[PDB]
mmCIF file of N, CA and C in Angstrom:
data_model
loop_
_atom_site.group_PDB
_atom_site.id
_atom_site.type_symbol
_atom_site.label_atom_id
_atom_site.label_comp_id
_atom_site.label_asym_id
_atom_site.label_seq_id
_atom_site.Cartn_x
_atom_site.Cartn_y
_atom_site.Cartn_z
ATOM 1 N N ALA Q 1 -45.141 6.706 36.232
ATOM 2 C CA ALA Q 1 -44.662 7.996 35.754
ATOM 3 C C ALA Q 1 -45.655 8.620 34.782
ATOM 4 N N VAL Q 2 -46.145 7.820 33.831
ATOM 5 C CA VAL Q 2 -47.096 8.338 32.852
ATOM 6 C C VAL Q 2 -48.378 8.782 33.544
ATOM 7 N N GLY Q 3 -48.856 7.983 34.499
ATOM 8 C CA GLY Q 3 -50.078 8.335 35.202
ATOM 9 C C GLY Q 3 -49.951 9.620 35.992
ATOM 10 N N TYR Q 4 -48.829 9.791 36.694
ATOM 11 C CA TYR Q 4 -48.639 11.012 37.471
ATOM 12 C C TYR Q 4 -48.502 12.236 36.574
ATOM 13 N N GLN Q 5 -47.784 12.109 35.455
ATOM 14 C CA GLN Q 5 -47.690 13.242 34.538
ATOM 15 C C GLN Q 5 -49.057 13.600 33.962
ATOM 16 N N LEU Q 6 -49.852 12.589 33.602
ATOM 17 C CA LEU Q 6 -51.194 12.851 33.097
ATOM 18 C C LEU Q 6 -52.059 13.517 34.158
ATOM 19 N N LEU Q 7 -51.955 13.061 35.407
ATOM 20 C CA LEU Q 7 -52.732 13.666 36.482
ATOM 21 C C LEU Q 7 -52.355 15.127 36.672
ATOM 22 N N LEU Q 8 -51.055 15.429 36.638
ATOM 23 C CA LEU Q 8 -50.612 16.812 36.756
ATOM 24 C C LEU Q 8 -51.115 17.677 35.612
ATOM 25 N N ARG Q 9 -51.103 17.167 34.383
ATOM 26 C CA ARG Q 9 -51.576 17.939 33.242
ATOM 27 C C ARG Q 9 -53.095 17.991 33.135
ATOM 28 N N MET Q 10 -53.812 17.144 33.868
ATOM 29 C CA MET Q 10 -55.262 17.066 33.756
ATOM 30 C C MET Q 10 -56.012 17.685 34.927
ATOM 31 N N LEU Q 11 -55.372 17.844 36.091
ATOM 32 C CA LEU Q 11 -56.071 18.376 37.260
ATOM 33 C C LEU Q 11 -56.674 19.752 37.006
ATOM 34 N N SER Q 12 -56.104 20.525 36.078
ATOM 35 C CA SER Q 12 -56.621 21.863 35.812
ATOM 36 C C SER Q 12 -58.023 21.840 35.216
ATOM 37 N N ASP Q 13 -58.452 20.707 34.654
ATOM 38 C CA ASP Q 13 -59.800 20.619 34.100
ATOM 39 C C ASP Q 13 -60.856 20.790 35.182
ATOM 40 N N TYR Q 14 -60.637 20.192 36.349
ATOM 41 C CA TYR Q 14 -61.581 20.261 37.453
ATOM 42 C C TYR Q 14 -61.229 21.338 38.470
ATOM 43 N N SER Q 15 -60.204 22.147 38.199
ATOM 44 C CA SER Q 15 -59.785 23.238 39.079
ATOM 45 C C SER Q 15 -59.456 22.717 40.479
ATOM 46 N N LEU Q 16 -58.430 21.870 40.537
ATOM 47 C CA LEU Q 16 -57.967 21.272 41.781
ATOM 48 C C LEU Q 16 -56.472 21.511 41.920
ATOM 49 N N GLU Q 17 -56.054 21.983 43.091
ATOM 50 C CA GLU Q 17 -54.646 22.251 43.350
ATOM 51 C C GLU Q 17 -53.979 20.998 43.897
ATOM 52 N N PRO Q 18 -52.913 20.502 43.272
ATOM 53 C CA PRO Q 18 -52.289 19.264 43.749
ATOM 54 C C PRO Q 18 -51.642 19.438 45.113
ATOM 55 N N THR Q 19 -51.664 18.356 45.889
ATOM 56 C CA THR Q 19 -51.056 18.314 47.208
ATOM 57 C C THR Q 19 -49.560 18.018 47.089
ATOM 58 N N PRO Q 20 -48.756 18.440 48.071
ATOM 59 C CA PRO Q 20 -47.304 18.212 47.974
ATOM 60 C C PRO Q 20 -46.902 16.751 47.849
ATOM 61 N N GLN Q 21 -47.633 15.828 48.479
ATOM 62 C CA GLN Q 21 -47.255 14.419 48.404
ATOM 63 C C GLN Q 21 -47.367 13.890 46.980
ATOM 64 N N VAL Q 22 -48.432 14.268 46.271
ATOM 65 C CA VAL Q 22 -48.580 13.852 44.880
ATOM 66 C C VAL Q 22 -47.446 14.416 44.036
ATOM 67 N N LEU Q 23 -47.066 15.669 44.288
ATOM 68 C CA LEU Q 23 -45.961 16.267 43.547
ATOM 69 C C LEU Q 23 -44.658 15.517 43.794
ATOM 70 N N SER Q 24 -44.388 15.158 45.051
ATOM 71 C CA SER Q 24 -43.169 14.416 45.356
ATOM 72 C C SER Q 24 -43.171 13.052 44.679
ATOM 73 N N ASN Q 25 -44.306 12.350 44.728
ATOM 74 C CA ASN Q 25 -44.394 11.052 44.066
ATOM 75 C C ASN Q 25 -44.164 11.185 42.567
ATOM 76 N N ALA Q 26 -44.789 12.189 41.948
ATOM 77 C CA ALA Q 26 -44.650 12.378 40.512
ATOM 78 C C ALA Q 26 -43.208 12.679 40.133
ATOM 79 N N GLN Q 27 -42.546 13.562 40.884
ATOM 80 C CA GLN Q 27 -41.181 13.920 40.519
ATOM 81 C C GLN Q 27 -40.233 12.751 40.748
ATOM 82 N N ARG Q 28 -40.471 11.953 41.793
ATOM 83 C CA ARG Q 28 -39.637 10.776 42.021
ATOM 84 C C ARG Q 28 -39.793 9.762 40.894
ATOM 85 N N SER Q 29 -41.033 9.507 40.470
ATOM 86 C CA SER Q 29 -41.249 8.569 39.373
ATOM 87 C C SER Q 29 -40.644 9.087 38.074
ATOM 88 N N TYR Q 30 -40.767 10.390 37.812
ATOM 89 C CA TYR Q 30 -40.172 10.959 36.607
ATOM 90 C C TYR Q 30 -38.652 10.869 36.648
ATOM 91 N N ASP Q 31 -38.055 11.084 37.823
ATOM 92 C CA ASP Q 31 -36.611 10.939 37.950
ATOM 93 C C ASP Q 31 -36.181 9.507 37.674
ATOM 94 N N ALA Q 32 -36.941 8.529 38.174
ATOM 95 C CA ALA Q 32 -36.626 7.135 37.866
ATOM 96 C C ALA Q 32 -36.735 6.862 36.369
ATOM 97 N N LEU Q 33 -37.787 7.384 35.732
ATOM 98 C CA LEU Q 33 -37.968 7.176 34.298
ATOM 99 C C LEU Q 33 -36.809 7.761 33.503
ATOM 100 N N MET Q 34 -36.380 8.975 33.849
ATOM 101 C CA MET Q 34 -35.266 9.579 33.127
ATOM 102 C C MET Q 34 -33.951 8.879 33.449
ATOM 103 N N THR Q 35 -33.835 8.300 34.646
ATOM 104 C CA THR Q 35 -32.664 7.496 34.975
ATOM 105 C C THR Q 35 -32.584 6.266 34.085
ATOM 106 N N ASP Q 36 -33.731 5.647 33.800
ATOM 107 C CA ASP Q 36 -33.728 4.413 33.018
ATOM 108 C C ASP Q 36 -33.167 4.630 31.616
ATOM 109 N N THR Q 37 -33.525 5.741 30.972
ATOM 110 C CA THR Q 37 -33.180 5.978 29.576
ATOM 111 C C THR Q 37 -32.029 6.965 29.405
ATOM 112 N N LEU Q 38 -31.113 7.029 30.365
ATOM 113 C CA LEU Q 38 -30.011 7.976 30.300
ATOM 114 C C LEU Q 38 -28.839 7.390 29.525
ATOM 115 N N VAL Q 39 -28.333 8.152 28.559
ATOM 116 C CA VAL Q 39 -27.128 7.799 27.816
ATOM 117 C C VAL Q 39 -26.168 8.979 27.880
ATOM 118 N N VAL Q 40 -24.908 8.701 28.196
ATOM 119 C CA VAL Q 40 -23.881 9.724 28.341
ATOM 120 C C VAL Q 40 -22.955 9.632 27.129
ATOM 121 N N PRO Q 41 -22.958 10.618 26.235
ATOM 122 C CA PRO Q 41 -22.068 10.560 25.072
ATOM 123 C C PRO Q 41 -20.608 10.614 25.489
ATOM 124 N N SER Q 42 -19.767 9.962 24.693
ATOM 125 C CA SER Q 42 -18.333 9.913 24.929
ATOM 126 C C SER Q 42 -17.624 10.711 23.845
ATOM 127 N N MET Q 43 -16.776 11.648 24.259
ATOM 128 C CA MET Q 43 -16.049 12.469 23.304
ATOM 129 C C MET Q 43 -15.005 11.640 22.566
ATOM 130 N N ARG Q 44 -14.654 12.095 21.369
ATOM 131 C CA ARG Q 44 -13.686 11.417 20.524
ATOM 132 C C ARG Q 44 -12.577 12.385 20.134
ATOM 133 N N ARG Q 45 -11.468 11.825 19.657
ATOM 134 C CA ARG Q 45 -10.316 12.640 19.304
ATOM 135 C C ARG Q 45 -10.651 13.560 18.132
ATOM 136 N N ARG Q 46 -9.866 14.632 18.006
ATOM 137 C CA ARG Q 46 -10.212 15.711 17.083
ATOM 138 C C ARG Q 46 -10.234 15.231 15.636
ATOM 139 N N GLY Q 47 -9.187 14.535 15.210
ATOM 140 C CA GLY Q 47 -9.089 14.118 13.826
ATOM 141 C C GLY Q 47 -7.728 14.420 13.239
ATOM 142 N N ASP Q 48 -7.109 15.501 13.709
ATOM 143 C CA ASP Q 48 -5.717 15.801 13.417
ATOM 144 C C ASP Q 48 -4.803 15.436 14.578
ATOM 145 N N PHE Q 49 -5.334 14.763 15.588
ATOM 146 C CA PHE Q 49 -4.526 14.344 16.723
ATOM 147 C C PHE Q 49 -3.552 13.255 16.287
ATOM 148 N N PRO Q 50 -2.272 13.363 16.630
ATOM 149 C CA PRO Q 50 -1.312 12.341 16.210
ATOM 150 C C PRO Q 50 -1.545 11.020 16.921
ATOM 151 N N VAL Q 51 -1.115 9.947 16.267
ATOM 152 C CA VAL Q 51 -1.060 8.619 16.863
ATOM 153 C C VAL Q 51 0.406 8.272 17.074
ATOM 154 N N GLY Q 52 0.762 7.925 18.304
ATOM 155 C CA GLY Q 52 2.156 7.760 18.655
ATOM 156 C C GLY Q 52 2.817 6.597 17.944
ATOM 157 N N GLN Q 53 4.146 6.560 18.058
ATOM 158 C CA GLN Q 53 4.924 5.485 17.455
ATOM 159 C C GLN Q 53 4.685 4.146 18.135
ATOM 160 N N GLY Q 54 4.149 4.146 19.356
ATOM 161 C CA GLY Q 54 3.899 2.902 20.058
ATOM 162 C C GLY Q 54 2.770 2.081 19.475
ATOM 163 N N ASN Q 55 1.903 2.698 18.675
ATOM 164 C CA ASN Q 55 0.806 1.974 18.050
ATOM 165 C C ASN Q 55 1.229 1.222 16.796
ATOM 166 N N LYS Q 56 2.478 1.382 16.353
ATOM 167 C CA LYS Q 56 2.998 0.701 15.169
ATOM 168 C C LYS Q 56 2.143 1.013 13.939
ATOM 169 N N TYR Q 57 2.139 2.288 13.557
ATOM 170 C CA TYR Q 57 1.349 2.732 12.417
ATOM 171 C C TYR Q 57 2.018 2.432 11.081
ATOM 172 N N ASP Q 58 2.988 1.520 11.055
ATOM 173 C CA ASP Q 58 3.594 1.077 9.807
ATOM 174 C C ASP Q 58 2.911 -0.170 9.256
ATOM 175 N N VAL Q 59 2.779 -1.214 10.079
ATOM 176 C CA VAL Q 59 2.236 -2.492 9.646
ATOM 177 C C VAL Q 59 0.984 -2.878 10.427
ATOM 178 N N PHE Q 60 0.862 -2.424 11.676
ATOM 179 C CA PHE Q 60 -0.309 -2.782 12.470
ATOM 180 C C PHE Q 60 -1.529 -1.966 12.056
ATOM 181 N N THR Q 61 -1.326 -0.698 11.706
ATOM 182 C CA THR Q 61 -2.396 0.202 11.299
ATOM 183 C C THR Q 61 -1.818 1.200 10.301
ATOM 184 N N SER Q 62 -2.687 1.802 9.487
ATOM 185 C CA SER Q 62 -2.269 2.818 8.526
ATOM 186 C C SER Q 62 -2.529 4.229 9.047
ATOM 187 N N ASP Q 63 -3.079 4.340 10.252
ATOM 188 C CA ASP Q 63 -3.496 5.619 10.810
ATOM 189 C C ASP Q 63 -2.304 6.338 11.418
ATOM 190 N N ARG Q 64 -1.848 7.402 10.759
ATOM 191 C CA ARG Q 64 -0.967 8.356 11.415
ATOM 192 C C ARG Q 64 -1.724 9.302 12.334
ATOM 193 N N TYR Q 65 -3.033 9.447 12.135
ATOM 194 C CA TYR Q 65 -3.869 10.317 12.947
ATOM 195 C C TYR Q 65 -5.223 9.653 13.145
ATOM 196 N N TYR Q 66 -5.901 10.040 14.216
ATOM 197 C CA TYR Q 66 -7.211 9.473 14.509
ATOM 198 C C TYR Q 66 -8.231 9.955 13.482
ATOM 199 N N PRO Q 67 -9.168 9.106 13.052
ATOM 200 C CA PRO Q 67 -10.309 9.609 12.273
ATOM 201 C C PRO Q 67 -11.185 10.517 13.120
ATOM 202 N N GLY Q 68 -11.599 10.011 14.280
ATOM 203 C CA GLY Q 68 -12.179 10.804 15.348
ATOM 204 C C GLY Q 68 -13.384 11.672 15.042
ATOM 205 N N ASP Q 69 -14.003 11.506 13.879
ATOM 206 C CA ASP Q 69 -15.182 12.298 13.550
ATOM 207 C C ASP Q 69 -16.406 11.446 13.262
ATOM 208 N N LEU Q 70 -16.254 10.376 12.485
ATOM 209 C CA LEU Q 70 -17.369 9.523 12.075
ATOM 210 C C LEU Q 70 -18.434 10.316 11.323
ATOM 211 N N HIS H 1 -2.212 -6.494 -52.561
ATOM 212 C CA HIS H 1 -2.770 -6.628 -53.898
ATOM 213 C C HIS H 1 -2.583 -8.046 -54.426
ATOM 214 N N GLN H 2 -3.495 -8.452 -55.306
ATOM 215 C CA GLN H 2 -3.429 -9.752 -55.956
ATOM 216 C C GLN H 2 -3.662 -9.578 -57.449
ATOM 217 N N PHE H 3 -3.064 -10.468 -58.238
ATOM 218 C CA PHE H 3 -3.074 -10.353 -59.688
ATOM 219 C C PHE H 3 -3.428 -11.688 -60.326
ATOM 220 N N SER H 4 -3.914 -11.635 -61.568
ATOM 221 C CA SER H 4 -4.298 -12.862 -62.308
ATOM 222 C C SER H 4 -3.470 -12.920 -63.580
ATOM 223 N N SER H 5 -3.569 -14.007 -64.342
ATOM 224 C CA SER H 5 -2.701 -14.166 -65.535
ATOM 225 C C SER H 5 -3.513 -14.648 -66.735
ATOM 226 N N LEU H 6 -3.037 -14.375 -67.948
ATOM 227 C CA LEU H 6 -3.730 -14.838 -69.175
ATOM 228 C C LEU H 6 -2.822 -15.843 -69.882
ATOM 229 N N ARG H 7 -3.389 -16.935 -70.392
ATOM 230 C CA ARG H 7 -2.588 -17.916 -71.160
ATOM 231 C C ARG H 7 -3.080 -17.942 -72.606
ATOM 232 N N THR H 8 -2.200 -17.657 -73.572
ATOM 233 C CA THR H 8 -2.571 -17.629 -75.010
ATOM 234 C C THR H 8 -1.451 -18.294 -75.822
ATOM 235 N N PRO H 9 -1.684 -18.886 -77.015
ATOM 236 C CA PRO H 9 -0.582 -19.466 -77.799
ATOM 237 C C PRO H 9 0.455 -18.423 -78.213
ATOM 238 N N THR H 10 -0.005 -17.264 -78.662
ATOM 239 C CA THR H 10 0.886 -16.119 -78.953
ATOM 240 C C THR H 10 0.320 -15.079 -77.997
ATOM 241 N N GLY H 11 1.118 -14.176 -77.442
ATOM 242 C CA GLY H 11 0.563 -13.296 -76.398
ATOM 243 C C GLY H 11 -0.209 -12.135 -76.959
ATOM 244 N N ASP H 12 -1.308 -12.409 -77.657
ATOM 245 C CA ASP H 12 -2.158 -11.282 -78.093
ATOM 246 C C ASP H 12 -3.070 -11.000 -76.908
ATOM 247 N N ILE H 13 -2.883 -9.853 -76.265
ATOM 248 C CA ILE H 13 -3.692 -9.453 -75.082
ATOM 249 C C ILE H 13 -4.564 -8.310 -75.589
ATOM 250 N N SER H 14 -4.797 -8.264 -76.903
ATOM 251 C CA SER H 14 -5.468 -7.098 -77.530
ATOM 252 C C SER H 14 -6.864 -6.787 -76.989
ATOM 253 N N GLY H 15 -7.734 -7.774 -76.810
ATOM 254 C CA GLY H 15 -9.094 -7.423 -76.353
ATOM 255 C C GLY H 15 -9.357 -7.894 -74.939
ATOM 256 N N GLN H 16 -8.572 -8.861 -74.456
ATOM 257 C CA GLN H 16 -8.803 -9.436 -73.107
ATOM 258 C C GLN H 16 -8.576 -8.345 -72.058
ATOM 259 N N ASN H 17 -9.411 -8.310 -71.020
ATOM 260 C CA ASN H 17 -9.296 -7.234 -70.008
ATOM 261 C C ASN H 17 -7.994 -7.421 -69.236
ATOM 262 N N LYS H 18 -7.255 -6.338 -69.016
ATOM 263 C CA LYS H 18 -6.004 -6.394 -68.223
ATOM 264 C C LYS H 18 -6.353 -6.276 -66.737
ATOM 265 N N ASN H 19 -5.445 -6.677 -65.847
ATOM 266 C CA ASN H 19 -5.732 -6.661 -64.392
ATOM 267 C C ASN H 19 -6.051 -5.231 -63.981
ATOM 268 N N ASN H 20 -7.126 -5.045 -63.223
ATOM 269 C CA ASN H 20 -7.524 -3.691 -62.771
ATOM 270 C C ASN H 20 -6.920 -3.466 -61.393
ATOM 271 N N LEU H 21 -6.721 -2.210 -61.001
ATOM 272 C CA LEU H 21 -6.059 -1.920 -59.705
ATOM 273 C C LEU H 21 -7.079 -1.432 -58.675
ATOM 274 N N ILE H 22 -7.373 -2.250 -57.662
ATOM 275 C CA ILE H 22 -8.330 -1.928 -56.612
ATOM 276 C C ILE H 22 -7.602 -1.994 -55.278
ATOM 277 N N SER H 23 -7.807 -0.984 -54.437
ATOM 278 C CA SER H 23 -7.142 -0.886 -53.147
ATOM 279 C C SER H 23 -8.155 -1.041 -52.022
ATOM 280 N N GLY H 24 -7.771 -1.788 -50.985
ATOM 281 C CA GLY H 24 -8.613 -2.030 -49.838
ATOM 282 C C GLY H 24 -8.184 -1.230 -48.616
ATOM 283 N N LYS H 25 -8.994 -1.350 -47.565
ATOM 284 C CA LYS H 25 -8.771 -0.617 -46.328
ATOM 285 C C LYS H 25 -9.182 -1.475 -45.139
ATOM 286 N N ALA H 26 -8.590 -1.170 -43.986
ATOM 287 C CA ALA H 26 -8.904 -1.852 -42.733
ATOM 288 C C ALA H 26 -8.910 -0.808 -41.626
ATOM 289 N N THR H 27 -10.098 -0.443 -41.154
ATOM 290 C CA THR H 27 -10.260 0.651 -40.205
ATOM 291 C C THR H 27 -10.345 0.115 -38.782
ATOM 292 N N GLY H 28 -9.735 0.839 -37.849
ATOM 293 C CA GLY H 28 -9.873 0.572 -36.430
ATOM 294 C C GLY H 28 -10.572 1.738 -35.759
ATOM 295 N N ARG H 29 -11.390 1.436 -34.754
ATOM 296 C CA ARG H 29 -12.222 2.439 -34.106
ATOM 297 C C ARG H 29 -11.998 2.390 -32.599
ATOM 298 N N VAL H 30 -12.585 3.356 -31.899
ATOM 299 C CA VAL H 30 -12.492 3.435 -30.453
ATOM 300 C C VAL H 30 -13.762 2.854 -29.846
ATOM 301 N N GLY H 31 -13.622 2.281 -28.651
ATOM 302 C CA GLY H 31 -14.720 1.681 -27.942
ATOM 303 C C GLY H 31 -15.320 2.607 -26.905
ATOM 304 N N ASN H 32 -16.111 2.022 -26.010
ATOM 305 C CA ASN H 32 -16.735 2.776 -24.938
ATOM 306 C C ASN H 32 -15.759 2.949 -23.777
ATOM 307 N N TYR H 33 -16.216 3.637 -22.737
ATOM 308 C CA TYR H 33 -15.394 3.875 -21.561
ATOM 309 C C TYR H 33 -15.495 2.709 -20.589
ATOM 310 N N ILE H 34 -14.354 2.306 -20.043
ATOM 311 C CA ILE H 34 -14.299 1.338 -18.956
ATOM 312 C C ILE H 34 -14.287 2.138 -17.662
ATOM 313 N N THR H 35 -15.461 2.341 -17.071
ATOM 314 C CA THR H 35 -15.608 3.234 -15.932
ATOM 315 C C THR H 35 -16.067 2.454 -14.712
ATOM 316 N N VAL H 36 -15.352 2.625 -13.606
ATOM 317 C CA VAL H 36 -15.776 2.141 -12.300
ATOM 318 C C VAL H 36 -15.687 3.303 -11.319
ATOM 319 N N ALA H 37 -16.762 3.527 -10.570
ATOM 320 C CA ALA H 37 -16.859 4.670 -9.676
ATOM 321 C C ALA H 37 -17.427 4.231 -8.338
ATOM 322 N N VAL H 38 -16.999 4.906 -7.274
ATOM 323 C CA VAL H 38 -17.480 4.635 -5.928
ATOM 324 C C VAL H 38 -17.862 5.951 -5.267
ATOM 325 N N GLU H 39 -18.793 5.870 -4.320
ATOM 326 C CA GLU H 39 -19.146 6.997 -3.473
ATOM 327 C C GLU H 39 -19.260 6.498 -2.041
ATOM 328 N N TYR H 40 -18.974 7.384 -1.093
ATOM 329 C CA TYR H 40 -18.794 6.955 0.284
ATOM 330 C C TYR H 40 -18.743 8.162 1.207
ATOM 331 N N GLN H 41 -18.663 7.873 2.503
ATOM 332 C CA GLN H 41 -18.424 8.884 3.529
ATOM 333 C C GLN H 41 -16.948 8.809 3.905
ATOM 334 N N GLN H 42 -16.210 9.891 3.644
ATOM 335 C CA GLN H 42 -14.756 9.847 3.752
ATOM 336 C C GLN H 42 -14.272 9.619 5.178
ATOM 337 N N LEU H 43 -15.028 10.056 6.187
ATOM 338 C CA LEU H 43 -14.611 9.809 7.565
ATOM 339 C C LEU H 43 -14.765 8.335 7.924
ATOM 340 N N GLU H 44 -15.854 7.705 7.473
ATOM 341 C CA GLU H 44 -16.001 6.265 7.659
ATOM 342 C C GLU H 44 -14.950 5.490 6.874
ATOM 343 N N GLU H 45 -14.593 5.968 5.680
ATOM 344 C CA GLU H 45 -13.533 5.329 4.909
ATOM 345 C C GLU H 45 -12.191 5.423 5.626
ATOM 346 N N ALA H 46 -11.893 6.578 6.223
ATOM 347 C CA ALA H 46 -10.612 6.782 6.888
ATOM 348 C C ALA H 46 -10.575 6.227 8.306
ATOM 349 N N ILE H 47 -11.560 5.420 8.700
ATOM 350 C CA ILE H 47 -11.615 4.854 10.044
ATOM 351 C C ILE H 47 -10.391 3.979 10.285
ATOM 352 N N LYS H 48 -10.106 3.073 9.345
ATOM 353 C CA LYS H 48 -8.934 2.213 9.447
ATOM 354 C C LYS H 48 -8.241 2.014 8.104
ATOM 355 N N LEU H 49 -8.598 2.786 7.081
ATOM 356 C CA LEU H 49 -8.072 2.627 5.727
ATOM 357 C C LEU H 49 -7.511 3.974 5.276
ATOM 358 N N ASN H 50 -6.200 4.143 5.432
ATOM 359 C CA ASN H 50 -5.562 5.412 5.114
ATOM 360 C C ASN H 50 -4.930 5.360 3.730
ATOM 361 N N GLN H 51 -4.651 6.539 3.172
ATOM 362 C CA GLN H 51 -4.052 6.739 1.854
ATOM 363 C C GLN H 51 -4.946 6.263 0.716
ATOM 364 N N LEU H 52 -6.141 5.748 1.020
ATOM 365 C CA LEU H 52 -7.099 5.294 0.009
ATOM 366 C C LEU H 52 -6.463 4.280 -0.940
ATOM 367 N N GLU H 53 -5.601 3.428 -0.392
ATOM 368 C CA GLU H 53 -4.896 2.427 -1.180
ATOM 369 C C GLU H 53 -5.594 1.075 -1.185
#
């Protein structure tokens, strides 16, 4: 991926137009690289959202509402 | 107060010094502050610790 990106950014020095196969290889490698380091954030409760009676917020927890902000 | 006494065959107290009256004092003062303080991020504090108890 690094090599293909460098080649794409450097070919202009020698005034050479890249061929479609090199472009396809570069974009495929870049897609793999971005796939490797992908993280999907997870949303959290608002903070004033109630916590139901089923959670036993008397003795099991003190939370009447979610903190949900951090 | 405390006092002393003179012993004489006849009670001539003519030249002997009589008990003098001196008053004392006992002062009380104030000390320093007993201070304990904390700082924190309130959302992290309220993660599982409510009412700040």
